[PDB]
Every structure is written in structure tokens, then in C-alpha cells.
Design a binder for this molecule. Structure first.
Ligand SMILES: [Fe+2]
Ligand SMILES: [Fe+2]
Lengths: 402, 402
């Protein structure tokens, strides 16, 4: 058992001062040191009077296999990005070898993230993910818009799913991802989702990431038409949007991006066991705009970084700074608090892990960070944490310091 | 004489490959190494084939005296920020002692800035500024909304101006700043601007930073009314906006912030020898919104950071990232190019120094930075410079490496 007394605790929902945290694997008590040592005389006390304790972040959406990308893929516009992925992935993917994967995951921890949602298209990231101390939801992604080759795509997905499933434990979950409504034909999607139903697996889907997707699904026109004509020899979207969305009705689903989702889709998703995953940097850099947080207010959201295929870092502090800036008309002190909650508790909820909150009974998944100096107004703490922090002093996963 | 051969030169307006730069104090030639050594057999050649050369940044607006602020001033809303400045400045200002000023200026250079516009309200930053290797326009700021005490405010301004003027040389210019149209009564402003006229000094003014200012000047109402009533015992704005703006007609002026400027003001300023100074982080953090770059397209703009009184860093790379994000609907590859030009050449133009461009005859004020790896499309270089760079490998001011 250990006790840490910081300047303040961000729970994340509240700011607690004049209390410490007793923990082992889980958070056991939150009280004054005076009271804690009565209960835990065996716990050494660390006084960190110029530090803050907050939960470890969740990052519920990242494409680890693309972690060698720096400037190879094309930014600025979604369809050119997708062409660039198709062009470069055969070389880019193997460039992220075991050492690259291992280092990338270690750096996630070092920047204060303690739980991730890994989107895996090819499965060669499995060993690195099971080796990591992180909590991981390992989403086995399926893709395939041609009904005639669904069998091959399904068989690969199924094999990857079962390869991951043997490694399940309290910190590692095997899951299912559907690439998108434009790239996964209905029947193949349903087959993959039936595996999720059978096992109670979490599900992720990219939904309405781009305006091109919006127009293609709605009208069978727009910039995606040339892409489907050239790349897939298809003249029309293979899916009816509403029918596709209904496939997710009985599952726990992460709807990623969601920038271009419409009011009807939002009402439907609000009725589901669903979370939106907001990836502000990726959306802005790919010419996809900015998710409107009023429009989606009926559905809980969490923050993620996406992969290094459409981001310059996997550091949640960088993501949170960008989030402040792409929602520039949200008053900063209150929005910073919202952001910290949505990067910790909300993402843990999306991933289904017992953490993201400094509360009794939660796993001791925590960050110890420096207190911004000269703080006048304690309610400004959330904002100053985002602005001034880039690396925690200590990061704990189930009480173990990394 | 020296020669550097990088992967590419950002001039900033163009990307040049397969050429090197010969320089001493000034850039002397841009040509292949083969051609340069014929002209400059005395110049050693540095091959930096995994680097880029670009101009040093200009940062035409910074309040150096507030460089001890981290979390003391109140963010989120302009008038509460101003109250916090009034409350805390007596203690905050002396906290930035000589060592703080010296370190702050050194860090500006280390982050790739080679020229600044320093706004000085009290003059205790003069020694540090003259000591720095930076190019500095040292703006002596005047403030005072009470016509009855204009003499005292004017005398202090005049003394500070002349104290700075004795230090003028090719890299250090004495200049004049008018705090704002709400805080400097017309007659005092005109007296200070007459000094600028006499000496041909550059001028800076904060103009339409906040909506409160807009409403106060336009209608004599809004959130500034309580402030003027309580703090100054004034019931009405002391200035007519148009009359105040006309004071700047015959001067070279930097109009800072400009978020809330109206169409009439923009047309007037476009007819003046004037630049807008865009401070995206400061404006967003103080609840002032975002400058609309279409609205002001008729007036050249440059990027600045403001002081650490309303920013978390003085690093232009951080400012440029934030600029990408607060203008999220500007296509990223082209906007990044615009930003790099507006942080180098445009800011040098605003400050009146011969730099900000890698061109023959300009001062050799340059940055050598790492080339982002794996670059497929060279036109993406500007974007990847912003995303992946935080500290140059070398920074030159008039050819001297720092
Ligand atoms: Fe993704
Ligand atoms: Fe300023």
C-alpha cells in the first residue's frame, strides 16, 4: 500500500485539495494523510506538494501499424490521403518493425496514456500490444467492398480475431472493427459483427469522417465517385446508410470521427450503446473539418489521437491543445475541464475499463504531473494542465510506476 | 564567407532544391556548390543533406516584461484578464528580473526567431533588449485615459523613448506604442505619435482585440462600461473611434489583434502604411475569438506570439501549429506555406528590417532545421516543418551562429 499527497487531485470531474490517495492495485481511499495512516500504517507517504494527480488518459483510437509515418502520407484532403495509404502501405507497414512498435507503445505510457484502443488491419502488431503494460482493446478490423471476395476478407479477420482472443485477460480485450460504411459491404460487416455479438466484443467503426463519404452514401455522387470507379470498378455505393447503421443497434460501438454525421444518424446513435471518438488533429489535417460538439451533444464523446498516419504525435497533451484551438469559441477554462474529463473518464467508459477516475475501487491508473507555477485561481487548473504539460513525472498502471 | 548546402531552401515563397547558399553577414549568392566555389574559393562548404534552410522568424509583438507569468493571470475572457493584470503586475513584473529577461530572449533565438517587436510599458527591459543579439524594435508604450494626468504619462513615455533612442543602431530601433483606443485619450495619443512623426519611428497599437472594446467604442455600452465606471470613474468612451484611427494616417503602424475590426476600419487601414499583427493563441485564450483572414485580406498580416501574459510559450513553431488549428477550414498544405511566409518575410516587413527572406542582399538571418523524414511530396514541406519542428539545429543572425 502507498500514499501520495499532491497539491490537488483532478478526479477528473472535481478538484480535491488537502487530501491524499492510498492505493495498491486499486485506489483504496481518498482522505487526509492524518486519516489515511490510521487505516494504512503500513503505507509509506510520498508528499508531492508541487504536483497534481489525475487519471491516466485513455486513447480509444489509434492505428499502431502506421507508426513509421512522418511525412510519407498525403495530408490536406481525405481522398488523396486514402490514395496515399493505398500507394505506400506495402512499404510503410514493414518499416514499423517490432522495435518501432515497442517504442511507440512505451512512448504512449510516458506521455500519460494508460489505456488504448488499437485498430489493427493486418495483425502484425499483436505481439507488441500483448507485451505492453497498457490496457488495450485490440480491434481486429475488417475491410472489403466487393461481396464476391467477402469470404477471403472474413477468413483473415476471423483468424486475426482468434489469434488475439487467446491473449485476453483483465487488461487485454479482443475486439472487432468495421472499417467504414463505404469500404465494408453490408454482408461482410454483418458477418464480422456476428462474431462481436457471439463474444460480447466491443466494436469500432469510422463513421462520416469526410464530406466525400457523406455525399457518396447520400447521393452516390461526389469526389468518392471517381475513386470507386477507378479503384473498385463500382458505380454506386454498395450500402444503404440506414441499413448499415442498424447493424450496430445491439452492440457497444465506438463511432469514430463523426464530423459529417447528420441529425437522423445522431438520433439513432444516441439510442444505441455508443460513444463518439473525437480525433481533432486527424480531422483537421485531412481536410475533414471539425466535429460540432453542440450537434452531437446527445451522445457521449471521448478524445483520441488516431495513428501517426494522420497525426504528428500520439501525445494526448498535444491532442488536447489542438482540441482547444479547433473549438476556439468555447470558453477556455470550462472547455479545458470538459476536455480533461473526456480524455480520461469518457475514454475509459468507451473502452470498458475500470479506470479514468481517481475514485475508490478504480484501478490506480494515474499520472503525477508538475503543478503549473503561480496559479491564482484553482478553477483554471485544467486549462493550465493542458497548456503547460507535455510529460508526466510518474505514470502508474494498476499501481505500478512506469 | 561560408556555404551551406541543405536538402532544400524555403525562401520562404519558394522551395529551392539542388542549390546552396553563400553568406557572410548577408546572403551573397544562391547557386549550386559547383558554381559557388568558383566565386568563393575561400568559403568552406557545409553539406547538410538532411536539413532545410529557412529564414529566421520575426515575432513583431511581445510583452517581455510579463515573462514570469505562467498561471498567475486570468485566462478565458478579456476584461477579467485586464483586471488580473492590474491586480498582479506590481508583483509579477519584478519577478522577471535580469536573469529572467536574458533567458527569455536567449530562448527566443533558440526557437528560431531572429527579430522581435518588444512592447515595453515600464522600460526596465531596455538593458536586456540592447544586450540581446536579436534585431529589436523597442516600442515604448504609452497609456492614459484621463486627460488631466496626460502630462505625467507623456513625460514617462518621453523619458523611456529617449533612453532607448541612444542605443539605436542597425539592429536596435526605438519606437512608439499606443496601448489602445479605450485606454489612451486622443490628446495623449497624438502627443506620443508626434514623437514618432518627428523621428520616423515605427508605431504599434492594440486595435479591436475584444468584443467589449468594439461595443464600448461603438455604443458606449457593454461589458467595458462597468470597468470604466469602477476603475476610471468614466461613463463614456473618451475617444471617437474614427478620429483616433486617423491619428495613424501618416505613420508606419502595426495594428495588433484586429479580431473585431469592422469593414470601414479595414478599408481605412488598407489605405495606410500598415500591417496587421495576428496573435492566434492570445486571442483564443482570452475569449477574443479568431481573426478572419478573408475579412482582412486587403491588409498584409504577420504572425506574433504576444507575451507570456497571454501565451504559454514564445516559440513561433507553437504559434504556427495553433494558427493551423484556429483556422481549421483552410486547406493545410497551402495554409502552412502562407503561415511560414507570414512568420518570416511579412514580419520582417512589419518591423522594417532587411531579412525574413533567403535572397541575395538580405541579412543572413536563418534557421537550419531537420528535414522531416520520408517526405513524398515536396510541396507538403511547409506543413511538415510546422508539425514536426520545435527547435532549429542552428540559428544565424547576420551570419553569426547562436
Ligand atoms: Fe482511424
Ligand atoms: Fe500585446
Amino acid at each position: 500500500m502507498r500514499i501520495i499527497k499532491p497539491f490537488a487531485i483532478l478526479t477528473p470531474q472535481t478538484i480535491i485539495q488537502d487530501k491524499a490517495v492510498a492505493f495498491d492495485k486499486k485506489i483504496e481511499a481518498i482522505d487526509t494523510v492524518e486519516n489515511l495512516i490510521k487505516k494504512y500504517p503500513n503505507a509509506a507517504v510520498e508528499h508531492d506538494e508541487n504536483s497534481l494527480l489525475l487519471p491516466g488518459f485513455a486513447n480509444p483510437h489509434l492505428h499502431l501499424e502506421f507508426s513509421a509515418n512522418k511525412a510519407t502520407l498525403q495530408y490536406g484532403d481525405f481522398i488523396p490521403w486514402l490514395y496515399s495509404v493505398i500507394r505506400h502501405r506495402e512499404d510503410l507497414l514493414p518499416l514499423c518493425d517490432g522495435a518501432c512498435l515497442e517504442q511507440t507503445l512505451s512512448s504512449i505510457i510516458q506521455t500519460g496514456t494508460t489505456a488504448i484502443g488499437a485498430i489493427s488491419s493486418y495483425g502484425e502488431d499483436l505481439q507488441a500490444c500483448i507485451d505492453s503494460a497498457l490496457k488495450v482493446v485490440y480491434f481486429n478490423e475488417v475491410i472489403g467492398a466487393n461481396a464476391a471476395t467477402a469470404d477471403v476478407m472474413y477468413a483473415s479477420f476471423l483468424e486475426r480475431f482468434h489469434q488475439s482472443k487467446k491473449h485476453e485477460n483483465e487488461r487485454f480485450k479482443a475486439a472487432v472493427a468495421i472499417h467504414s460504411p463505404y469500404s465494408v459491404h453490408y454482408i461482410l460487416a454483418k458477418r464480422a459483427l456476428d462474431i462481436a455479438k457471439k463474444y460480447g466484443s466491443l466494436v469500432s467503426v469510422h463513421f462520416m469522417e469526410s464530406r466525400a463519404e457523406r455525399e457518396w452514401l447520400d447521393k452516390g455522387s461526389g469526389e468518392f465517385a471517381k475513386f470507386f470507379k477507378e479503384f473498385l470498378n463500382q458505380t454506386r455505393p454498395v450500402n444503404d446508410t440506414k441499413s448499415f447503421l442498424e447493424l450496430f443497434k445491439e452492440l457497444h460501438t465506438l463511432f469514430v470521427h463523426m464530423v459529417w454525421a447528420n441529425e437522423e444518424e445522431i438520433q439513432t446513435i444516441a439510442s444505441y450503446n455508443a460513444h463518439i471518438i473525437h480525433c481533432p488533429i486527424s480531422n483537421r489535417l485531412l481536410g475533414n473539418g471539425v466535429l460540432d460538439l453542440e450537434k452531437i451533444k446527445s451522445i457521449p464523446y471521448a478524445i483520441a489521437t488516431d495513428g501517426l498516419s494522420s497525426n504528428y504525435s500520439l501525445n494526448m497533451y498535444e491532442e488536447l491543445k489542438a482540441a482547444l484551438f479547433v473549438h476556439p469559441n468555447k470558453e477556455a477554462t470550462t472547455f479545458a475541464k470538459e476536455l480533461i474529463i473526456r480524455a480520461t473518464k469518457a475514454g475509459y467508459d468507451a473502452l470498458g475499463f475500470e479506470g479514468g477516475e481517481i475514485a475508490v475501487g478504480k484501478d490506480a491508473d494515474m499520472q503525477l504531473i508538475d503543478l503549473p507555477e503561480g496559479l491564482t485561481n484553482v478553477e483554471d487548473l485544467y486549462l493550465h494542465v493542458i497548456l503547460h504539460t507535455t510529460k508526466p513525472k510518474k505514470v502508474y498502471i494498476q499501481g505500478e510506476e512506469h
